[PDB]
Amino acid sequence: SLMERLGGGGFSARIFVGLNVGDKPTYTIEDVVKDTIAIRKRQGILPDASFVAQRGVYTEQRSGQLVTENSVQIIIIDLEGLSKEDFTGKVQALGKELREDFKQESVIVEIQERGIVQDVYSITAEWYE
Amino acid sequence: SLMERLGGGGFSARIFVGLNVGDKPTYTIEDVVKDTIAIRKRQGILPDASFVAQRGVYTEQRSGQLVTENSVQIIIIDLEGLSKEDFTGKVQALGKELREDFKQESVIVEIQERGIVQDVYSITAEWYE
Amino acid sequence: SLMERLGGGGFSARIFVGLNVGDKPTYTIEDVVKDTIAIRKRQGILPDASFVAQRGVYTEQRSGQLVTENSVQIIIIDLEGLSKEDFTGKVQALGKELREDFKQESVIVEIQERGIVQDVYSITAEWYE
Ligand SMILES: CSC[C@H]1O[C@@H](n2cnc3c(N)ncnc32)[C@H](O)[C@@H]1O
Ligand SMILES: CSC[C@H]1O[C@@H](n2cnc3c(N)ncnc32)[C@H](O)[C@@H]1O
Ligand SMILES: CSC[C@H]1O[C@@H](n2cnc3c(N)ncnc32)[C@H](O)[C@@H]1O
Ligand code: PRO
Ligand code: PRO
Ligand code: PRO
Ligand code: NA
Ligand code: NA
Ligand code: NA
């Protein structure tokens, strides 16, 4: 076998997406898998990724209610040697669309470069209050 | 949606907790979820976190017996902008209490700052020998 | 309990192994657990590790077919204080043998030092074309 060392700036990302809508279990990990593939194909990027099922705990920002839910951690290692701005923008857009598609209050996105965190973002719904 | 960049020093942690007591499967991931919420509430900290079910392999330190068990990886991203000492102390205390509550020989705690590991600790029972 | 800080250079690794052979679901996480234990014992190293079940998406390199499969993320924290070359070589050998044993096109290996990525490798089959 060939031991090929990966090219580029060493970008990776983690995205956390919950599967409850408020206190109601609603979605599944496979829904997130399929939606992520579809979004990434429309970006023209290789969709390759890992999806980890989790239990998650989140405090709702408006009401303060604590929710325990199923959630998904998406792990993306860049295998295409994208620029920092290109990778970051595509991951941000993916997180923003996942938030809408799963009707979520918040999606967390972490961007790394050689494992060093460049940015942690909370993508937060602007539902009118 | 708002793309809010997270504040503070960028602290996060990972805690590994097994669910066997010796060679006996005993606990579940939901037990760890509930106990973690309870401990973190008593610390006055937001309990928000992710919990990953795993299979784990561990060599018992006294007997050398190899155990294969279910285990839990707790992933904590600090969203409250705590100081390094405050975050580290609260995570250490959480790990120490989880070790007791689940009757474990060892719990592993990793503390990161912007993804860079600051400390890896093995929290080890002092059972008399 | 004792809060023991871990010794050595702070090495860790992640290995991603799929469980499909082409488009056919074939293997299970427990198969990977058992095979990893066996390989690491023959290396003379402590086998201790974590194994995370995942859904994975991979683009086959020859045909371009997109596969969705079950997969495993192996997480290894070095608890024995190995040298960089010793740890790296043993993890590389483990990944290469897992690729063969599970008839895989590609296995991904990431090596970290204090969380900073030193190398990401794709271990790729050299099947004749
Ligand atoms: C943002 S809410 C969606 C999911 O993100 C994860 N999550 C939320 N807050 C945190 C946090 N501070 N640390 C780790 N994971 C979190 C949990 O898995 C949750 O189900
Ligand atoms: C400390 S024993 C509890 C759990 O920690 C994890 N674990 C133990 N040792 C290691 C190691 N060296 N690397 C990664 N995970 C480990 C395994 O999931 C185990 O079930
Ligand atoms: C290498 S194919 C084996 C497994 O590796 C993981 N994988 C493949 N490519 C990527 C990638 N670019 N980022 C993250 N995980 C990936 C997926 O879980 C897959 O099932
Ligand atoms: O967005 C929601 O409504 C729930 C709570 C956190 C993520 N899932
Ligand atoms: O502590 C115990 O007894 C088992 C072995 C490792 C963690 N769970
Ligand atoms: O190697 C294979 O055939 C499948 C596709 C990626 C990993 N598992
Ligand atoms: Na890939
Ligand atoms: Na949160
Ligand atoms: Na161990």
Author numbering:
A (entry chain A), B (entry chain A), C (entry chain A): 1 to 129
List sentences from the manuscript.
Svi3-3 represents the first structure of a phage-encoded SAM degrading enzyme. Svi3-3 forms a trimer of ferredoxin-like fold alpha–beta sandwiches, where each subunit has two helices on the outside and a five-stranded anti-parallel beta sheet at the center. The subunits pack in a triangular manner, forming continuous beta sheets with their neighbors and are each in a ‘velcro-like’ topology where residues 2–6 at the N terminus of one subunit form beta-sheet interactions with residues 120–124 in β8 of another subunit. Prompted by DFT calculations producing high energy barriers for a hydrolysis reaction within the active site of Svi3-3, the TLC assays and NMR show unambiguously that Svi3-3 is a SAM lyase forming homoserine lactone and MTA.
When expressed from the T7-promoter expression plasmid, the proteins were highly toxic and the tightly regulated, arabinose-inducible BL21-AI cells had to be used to allow cell growth until induction. An N-terminally truncated 146 amino acid construct of Svi3-3, where the hexahistidine tag had been removed (Svi3-3_d19, Supplementary file 1-table 1), formed crystals in the presence of SAM or the analogue S-adenosyl homocysteine (SAH). The crystals diffracted to 1.45 Å resolution in space group F4132 and the structure was solved using ab initio methods with Arcimboldo. There is one monomer in the asymmetric unit, forming a trimer around the threefold crystallographic axis. Apart from the disordered C-terminal 16 residues, the full structure could be built. In the structure from co-crystallization with SAM, catalysis has occurred and the product MTA is observed in identical position as the corresponding part of SAH, with the methyl group pointing away from Glu69, while a proline molecule from the cryo buffer is bound in the second half of the active site, mimicking the second product. The protein structures are virtually identical in the presence of SAH and MTA (root mean square deviation [RMSD] of 0.16 Å over 129 Cα atoms). Our activity assay is based on detection of MTA that is also observed in the structure from co-crystallization of Svi3-3 with SAM. Thus, MTA is indeed formed in the reaction. Since MTA and SAH show a perfect overlap between the two structures, any such difference in binding mode between SAM and SAH is likely to involve the methionine end of the substrate, where MD indicates that Tyr58 forms a cation-π interaction with the positively charged sulfur.
